[PDB]
């Protein structure tokens, strides 16, 4: 609750994060769980690779620990692996860096916790329900009695928004004005959109937070980028910077692939064995979280809009079905149900046609076939592909391509609403492919745009008196 | 798209059908599947009857083809069956007639496909979503460039409706004015309605398309039927025509009965073994598809109205109270749950409840009793809308009996609202009974009405300038 | 159908009750069942205690009637119990009083039947179905022919409402103006509300129907209560009356506690046995039925409003959930699904991973763990605005505290919206506690309010020309 002591963007961001992860205790536990998941993936994997004797486990009454090798031997068997030891050393260095960041992260969050309790007066018990609007009302009312900020200017409730969302408004405006290569023309497919978690991380590491970024303070643009002249040397410097960051990505490719290959397999293989159709459900597409997002919109407001409008969008995506597939389903159901009805009447009649060594199995198969076809056979209604279903999905999100409103029922509309709707299997595939795809897009497709990026940041960056250097659109 | 290359109706109907079966390819496949279903039913049945050695299959490790007899013997075993060979010859003649009609139909449908692509400019890809609306308005614009009709004003298409629906408006007006015997007074039941697929086929074969029908052209009524005189000789001729068509039906009775047998088996017996309650769901009743029809209404508009209004109608069939029972359920649940609670508290206390000769059986029977009663006990706070149910169903249908609106809750209303919405099982039964019932209704109940049918077709048949002879009501 | 034979209330109320219990035959049967439930509870209550030899039943093949003792001995064993014989004599006297009231009631309900059939012309078959408005539309039109009572007033169309609901409007206005102690401040809990069936019965027995009540006729207030003077002696007399009625309650406490014990114990426990979560569902309360009730509102209109608005209220009560647990669920699901995915991949790979010392149990326990966690994981995309919903509950209930509309999401709102909506189990507990709690509230908390009760009944009691003495608010 101190008198404007440390850079603001961070203080406010931390305050917001503490409100989101409902309370200090919850947040601390969440971070600890995040650290234990990494360590568990890595240690479980290195235990499966190195310590388990699969041959004895498989064939050659056996108790579970009959497989495992004693530690006095596991250490030697894992140590005589140069590749494994190297991956483990890099993994442990990343881990130690994350644990050290966590330490302070909590040493700096105890300060926000005391801020809440003593200056805002919202106990951690009343915080999951304290709500954002009131807190906003609390912080802005607190600004007076207790000194905070320069005091040159009193808070105005949009300052806090700019502080929390400075770099995110920049991402919104970058993606909105078609910088930042996302569209690609793949052979054998339409124009794909490839925007992942790692790619946006790299874009922010290149532009916003790094050793030689565009920003020096986290609230002020470096002095040269405001100058109209020397734009070409700045463009060359940015191009070289992004070249070398792309090369670091290309060199780290195997390790992130491993983790990506690994964590992912673990994450959904359970779900696959349970309900293989959970991966057929659709999610709201990182490109699409950035496209449908307003300028000064905190994460919880975007996500509230995005799930208020989720079931209309699933009703839309499921409303168009192939007639042909429908006809094939109907007739395959007829022929399979006919052969099965005959075989069922026989097994009912005598019961020794049952479990024909061949028949029983087919009966099931044929049963699987009839069930699949009946699932593909449409049932009555839901065929609208309506202007109206769109007319409600839009009412939620509020943005649509302008060539969508008329032809809501075509393959052009579905195909590029498809890109926003993101069925997950692809997400998981698209997050797997990002280690190997992000360096080459970063080296080839973005380096030509560096001279346009420089002109964006020079042209669209306003200095607002209290907040510093913010995007020009987010005003 | 040759100008006046044909009478308007056999062209417009085909165009409409091509829009419905979404595209030429789809339609072709659908027809092929329709031809393969007939051939499969007949060949599978004759294989089951004639080639399989059931004794070895049942009792006397055995592979499946150990049952089947070699073809060199199947041919002789199926050939030495006069009844089977005769049924197969009649079946093959009907099949060959259907295959020849199919070849002629696709040779005539390639012309409509070229019509679409070249004169309407709707590719087969944009046709499942082109929409009827698009083409119906569009052709009317084509009427200028690619001319049709020797002397044609741009098609209002109001007329075009007339072309597609000439004979169907006649059926609607026949059933609407209570010609065409449908109501019957069966002993042991109320007034049944018996209107099937075969019966309406026979009515149309008698009245509209045949060797000596009422119509000579498909768009013009024969010249004598417009004359007021000679009505009695025309009535006698129509009566003799329908007598002999009924006798043809009576002679073909065994074959159509056999057909309705096997197709259903395969079609339904599978569904019975899967979900015996799927046949308890209700369907919209061929009488009822003709009763709830609306002026000049293409099939897809009727079906859209009919399924928009399907779930309200199931909630209605579902809704009525049976109140006195409710009380019996409540109080039987009380007394049974009381005795069971005592016996349960005892078996929990000591666990030596058993050895009583009937105890355990008493607990099980009492549990069944409580569960049945609780199923009959209405759920509290379950809303009831008799007025609404007999209101929203009408809003979707738009036609109502004048004695339904007041007493929505009586057995008179349910009993005759049932016929319109009758359940699938009585549908399958009523389609089974039509081979044996259609000839006798056709001979006995319709031949007395021939003099009224003649007066209908003389009185209600207007000559509209562009379309020809249409029903007088459908104007 | 005669003229003014009985008090209008004693006629109109009966007419309304006959419409509610749909018909005379129903009403009778319901009353007979009500009489048989009392006698059945008391019977075994006494057969289980007195005639059954539990020792032989438990331990010392045995048929059920091997336990029971012969009647020649049951009579002596139940007769040599002074406490049991005394409870049975009091129970039999209450029963005989109820049976005599039942005979008198059906002898008076036949008259009413005849009223329906002959003067209203609504047969008992068309009654469950008559609908309320129609009777209203029938009785008021009948007032001309079979003249109604005095016939002083033609039907008011409100008069019937006042007649049926005279004392209930008084209860509504008493509870509405915070007479009638309901709120209590218990230690260890918030302000509890204790309003039961027995407490409201006692309030009505004290105020409305008794030997020395406020009312002498059932439609006229005693003459002294209209006088401004002598208010203090009337207050003292009312205080003494309620003191002695409270003392009668305190003396009858053991018997009502037992009966409360017996009648309740039997019913609910079995249900809990079946589904222990049925008692976690919530019901509207005697209170809350009196708080949310309009003035001249018949019981069926209140209950229609109350169940139209029941599911919104359950959605509200279930909306608040722990942030912390969620996190535990998510991460336990991760770790369990990870170990299970590994073990599943192994059992798929070789199939002999199974049959290992812990193999056929770890997979099952881990599957249960993942399923439990996934049930605790909230559905992502799940939209709950607690604040928004209360709006629909209000649209149905129609009454609310002012300080709810803003803070719909707080514990203050839930805590006192809890009182209106409390779950069954506290209902059954609160009906159990009323025998022992009603006398002390009646003696201590209401006797101080007697001088305010007298001033209420003097100030708010209007004489309306046709109906007599009605509450002043219910106008």
* Contact flag C33-B331 (C-beta cutoff 8 Å): yes
Torsional class of B367: left (φ above 0), alpha (ψ -120 to 50), beta (otherwise): alpha
* Contact flag A29-C324 (C-beta cutoff 8 Å): yes
Q: Are strands A191-193 and A468-470 parallel, antiparallel or unpaired?
A: unpaired
Q: Retrieve residue A283's tokens.
A: 């999610």
Q: What CA–CA distance (Å, rounded) separates B165 from B290?
A: 13
Grouping H, G, I as helix, E, B as strand and the rest as coil, residue B469 is strand
Q: What CA–CA distance (Å, rounded) separates B71 from A429?
A: 53
Contacts of B303 (CB under 8 A, 6+ apart): none
Q: Nearest by CB to B355, which of C33, C62, C274?
A: C62
CA A332 to chain centre: 40
**Closest-CA distance of chain B to residue A360, Å:** 12
Q: What CA–CA distance (Å, rounded) separates A162 from A467?
A: 7
Task: Give phi and psi for B405, each to the nearest 5.
Answer: -60, -35
Which of B20, C100, B140 is closest to A327 using CA atoms?
B20
* Contact flag A410-B307 (C-beta cutoff 8 Å): no
Q: What CA–CA distance (Å, rounded) separates B269 from B257?
A: 17
Q: Nearest by CB to C341, which of A30, A66, A270?
A: A270
Sign of the torsion formed by the C-alpha atoms of C288, C292, C294 and C295 = positive
Q: Where does A358-449 have alpha helices with state H?
A: 359-376, 387-397, 411-421, 424-432, 434-444
Residues of A with CB under 8 A from a CB of C: 21-23, 25-26, 29-30, 33, 36-37, 40-41, 44, 48, 57-59, 61-64, 66, 128-129, 131, 265-267, 269-271, 273-274, 304, 306-308, 310-311
C-alpha to C-alpha distances, B179 to B182, B209, B287, C365, nearest whole angstrom: 8, 19, 13, 71
Residue A459 CB: number of other CB atoms within 10 A? 9
Contacts of C140 (CB under 8 A, 6+ apart): C154, C155, C157, C160
Q: What CA–CA distance (Å, rounded) separates A271 from A278?
A: 7
Torsional class of C222: left (φ above 0), alpha (ψ -120 to 50), beta (otherwise): beta
Contacts of C335 (CB under 8 A, 6+ apart): A37, A40
| C-beta contacts of C103-111 below 8 A and 24+ residues apart | C105/C31, C106/C28, C106/C31, C108/C6, C108/C14, C109/C14, C109/C18, C109/C24, C109/C27, C109/C28, C110/C24, C111/C5
Residue with tokens 């094939």: A328
Contacts of A198 (CB under 8 A, 6+ apart): A256, A431, A434, A435, A438
C-beta separation of C74 from C50 below 8 A: yes
Which of A199, A197, A167 is closest to A184 using CA atoms?
A199
**Residue to substitute from C319, C321, C322, C323, interface A, most A β-carbons within 10 A:** C323
C-beta separation of C439 from C220 below 8 A: no
**Closest-CA distance of chain A to residue B307, Å:** 7
Which of B436, B171, B115, B166 is closest to B289 using CA atoms?
B171
**Closest-CA distance of chain A to residue C383, Å:** 6
Strand partners, B463: B469
Q: What CA–CA distance (Å, rounded) separates A195 from A187?
A: 18
Q: What CA–CA distance (Å, rounded) separates C433 from B470?
A: 81
Q: What CA–CA distance (Å, rounded) separates B425 from B277?
A: 10
| C-beta contacts of C267-270 below 8 A and 24+ residues apart | C267/B334, C267/B337, C267/B338, C267/B341, C268/C428, C269/B341, C269/B345, C270/B337, C270/B338, C270/B340, C270/B341, C270/B344, C270/B370
**Residue to substitute from B60, B129, B131, B270, interface A, most A β-carbons within 10 A:** B270
A37 membership: H or E segment, kind and range: helix A24-50
Q: What CA–CA distance (Å, rounded) separates C239 from C449?
A: 9
Q: Retrieve residue C47's tokens.
A: 């057969």
**Residue to substitute from C338, C340, C349, C409, interface A, most A β-carbons within 10 A:** C338
* Contact flag C267-B337 (C-beta cutoff 8 Å): yes
Grouping H, G, I as helix, E, B as strand and the rest as coil, residue C184 is strand
C192 membership: H or E segment, kind and range: strand C191-193
C-beta separation of C402 from C163 below 8 A: no
A26 membership: H or E segment, kind and range: helix A24-50
C-alpha to C-alpha distances, C409 to C380, C412, C417, nearest whole angstrom: 20, 9, 11
Grouping H, G, I as helix, E, B as strand and the rest as coil, residue A6 is coil
Contacts of C332 (CB under 8 A, 6+ apart): C369, C373
* Contact flag B327-C40 (C-beta cutoff 8 Å): no
C-beta separation of B471 from B461 below 8 A: yes
* Contact flag B409-C306 (C-beta cutoff 8 Å): no
* Contact flag B383-C61 (C-beta cutoff 8 Å): no
Task: Give phi and psi for C407, each to the nearest 5.
Answer: -100, 75
Q: Retrieve residue A326's tokens.
A: 């429908």
Q: Angle at the Cα of A290 (from A288 to A295), degrees rounded to 5? A: 135
Q: What CA–CA distance (Å, rounded) separates A96 from A249?
A: 20
C-beta separation of B441 from B435 below 8 A: no
Residue B144 CB: number of other CB atoms within 10 A? 8
B184 membership: H or E segment, kind and range: strand B183-185
- The chains in contact with chain A, meaning 3 or more Cβ pairs closer than 8 Å, are B, C
b/e map C398-417, b = 16+ CB within 10 Å: eebeeebeebbbbeebbebb
CB contacts, 8 Å: C30 with chain B: 327
Q: What CA–CA distance (Å, rounded) separates B368 from A50?
A: 58
Q: DSSP assignment of A87-103, as one string?
A: HHHHHHHHHHHHHHHHH
Grouping H, G, I as helix, E, B as strand and the rest as coil, residue B221 is strand
CB contacts, 8 Å: A306 with chain C: 381
> After what residue numbers is chain A broken, C–N > 2.5 angstroms?
60
Q: What CA–CA distance (Å, rounded) separates B348 from C273?
A: 11
Q: Retrieve residue A250's tokens.
A: 């290309």
* Contact flag B410-C310 (C-beta cutoff 8 Å): no
Q: Where does C350-404 have alpha helices with state H?
A: 359-376, 386-397
Q: What CA–CA distance (Å, rounded) separates C139 from C120?
A: 7
C-beta separation of A421 from A284 below 8 A: yes
* Contact flag A273-C344 (C-beta cutoff 8 Å): yes
Residue C373 CB: number of other CB atoms within 10 A? 21
Q: Which residue of B has its CA nearest to A353?
A: B58
Resolution in A: 4.0
For chain B, the domains span: 9-155, 183-281+426-470, 312-418
* Contact flag A324-B29 (C-beta cutoff 8 Å): yes
Q: What CA–CA distance (Å, rounded) separates B357 from A108?
A: 74
b/e map B163-180, b = 16+ CB within 10 Å: bbbbbbbbbbbbbeeebb
Q: Nearest by CB to C62, which of B337, B349, B356?
A: B356
Which of B154, B206, B141 is closest to B179 using CA atoms?
B206
CB contacts, 8 Å: B338 with chain C: 40-41, 44, 266-267, 270
Q: Retrieve residue A270's tokens.
A: 């359970």
Q: Nearest by CB to A341, which of B57, B62, B269?
A: B269
Q: What CA–CA distance (Å, rounded) separates A122 from A138?
A: 9
Torsional class of B230: left (φ above 0), alpha (ψ -120 to 50), beta (otherwise): left
Q: Which residue of B has its CA nearest to A349?
A: B58
Experimental method: cryo-EM
**Closest-CA distance of chain A to residue C329, Å:** 12
Q: What CA–CA distance (Å, rounded) separates A177 from B310?
A: 49
Sign of the torsion formed by the C-alpha atoms of B298, B302, B305 and B310 = negative
- The chains in contact with chain B, meaning 3 or more Cβ pairs closer than 8 Å, are A, C
């Amino acid at each position: 609750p101190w008198h404007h002591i440390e850079n603001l963007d961070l203080f406010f961001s931390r305050v917001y994060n503490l409100h989101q992860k409902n309370g200090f205790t919850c947040m601390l536990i969440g971070e600890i769980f995040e650290l234990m998941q990494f360590l568990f993936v890595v240690a479980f994997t290195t235990f499966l690779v190195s310590c388990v004797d699969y041959d004895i486990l498989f064939a050659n009454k056996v108790t579970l620990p009959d497989a495992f090798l004693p530690a006095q031997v596991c250490s030697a068997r894992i140590q005589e692996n140069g590749s494994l030891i190297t991956i483990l050393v890099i993994a442990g260095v990343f881990w130690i860096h994350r644990l050290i960041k966590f330490i302070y992260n909590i040493c700096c969050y105890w300060e926000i916790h005391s801020f809440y309790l003593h200056a805002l007066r919202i106990p951690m018990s009343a915080l999951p329900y304290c709500t954002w609007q009131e807190v906003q009302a609390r912080i802005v009312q607190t600004q007076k009695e207790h000194q905070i900020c320069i005091h040159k200017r009193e808070l105005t409730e949009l300052d806090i928004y700019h502080r929390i969302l400075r770099f995110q408004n920049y991402m919104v405006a970058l993606v909105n004005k078609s910088l930042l290569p996302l569209r690609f023309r793949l052979p054998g497919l339409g124009e794909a959109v490839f925007f992942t978690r790692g790619l946006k991380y790299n874009f922010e590491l290149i532009l916003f937070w790094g050793p030689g970024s565009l920003f020096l303070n986290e609230w002020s643009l470096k002095a040269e980028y405001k100058r109209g002249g020397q734009r070409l040397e700045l463009a060359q410097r940015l191009s070289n910077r992004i070249l070398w960051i792309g090369i670091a990505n290309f060199l780290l490719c195997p390790l992130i692939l491993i983790w990506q290959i690994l964590y992912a397999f673990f994450s959904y293989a359970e779900v696959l064995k349970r309900e293989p159709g959970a991966l057929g459900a659709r999610c709201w597409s990182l490109y699409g979280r950035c496209y449908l997002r307003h300028f000064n919109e905190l994460e919880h407001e975007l996500q509230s809009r995005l799930n208020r409008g989720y079931k209309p969008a699933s009703k839309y995506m499921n409303c168009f079905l192939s007639p042909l597939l429908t006809l094939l389903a109907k007739n395959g159901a007829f022929f399979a149900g006919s052969i099965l009805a005959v075989l069922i009447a026989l097994t009912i009649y005598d019961e020794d046609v049952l479990a024909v060594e061949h028949v029983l199995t087919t009966v099931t198969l044929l049963g699987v076939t009839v069930t699949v076809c009946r699932s593909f056979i449409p049932d009555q209604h839901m065929v609208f592909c309506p202007e109206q279903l769109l007319r409600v999905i839009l009412a939620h999100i509020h943005y649509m391509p302008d060539h969508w409103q008329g032809n809501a029922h075509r393959s052009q509309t579905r195909d590029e609403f498809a890109q926003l709707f993101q069925y997950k299997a692809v997400f998981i595939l698209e997050e797997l492919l990002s280690p190997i795809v992000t360096p080459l897009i970063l080296i080839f497709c973005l380096r030509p745009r560096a001279l346009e990026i420089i002109d964006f940041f020079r042209n669209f960056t306003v200095e607002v008196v209290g907040v510093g250097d913010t995007c020009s659109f987010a005003q």
